[PDB]
A paper describes a structure:
All crystal structures of nat_mutants with WT-like RNA-binding (nat_mutants P67S, A119S, E136D and P151S) superimpose well with the NTD WT with RMSD values between 0.592 and 1.776 Å. Mutated residues in the above-named nat_mutants lie peripheral to the structural core, which further supports both the converging structures and the unaltered apparent RNA-binding affinities.
One central protein involved in the formation of regulatory ribonucleoprotein complexes (RNP) is the coronaviral structural protein nucleocapsid (N). N plays a major role in RNA genome replication, translation, and packaging and has further been found to interfere with host-integrated stress responses and stress granule formation.
Residue numbers in the entry: 48 to 174
The structure:
Amino acid sequence: NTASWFTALTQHGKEDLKFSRGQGVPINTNSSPDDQIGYYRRATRRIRGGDGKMKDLSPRWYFYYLGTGPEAGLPYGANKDGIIWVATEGALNTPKDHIGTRNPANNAAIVLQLPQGTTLPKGFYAE
Ligand SMILES: [Cl-]
């Protein structure tokens, strides 16, 4: 059982996460230009509120390299609710099994950083 290599982007507003073409891949100096491609997957947790009924928390969007993670089998551009795709110029459309996912027992998450000039929808924040 594994985890995203990066911390999540929390959705504070009504808009799903979306990036303009060529944007959205997190910075990771340990990966190469061919690897800069993947998807974000929405994870929506539920909690028992103060009243006593269940409710959704803010959705969290986690990045996974193409061909890894909970949707490792999906090809780039696959239509699936809660999955959005991103790729940098120069990336290769091949599975990134060599990067894989993170084992939290032996690796901390990488703080998710987006390069300068990256635009986001309302309610998401870039570090
Ligand atoms: Cl947050």
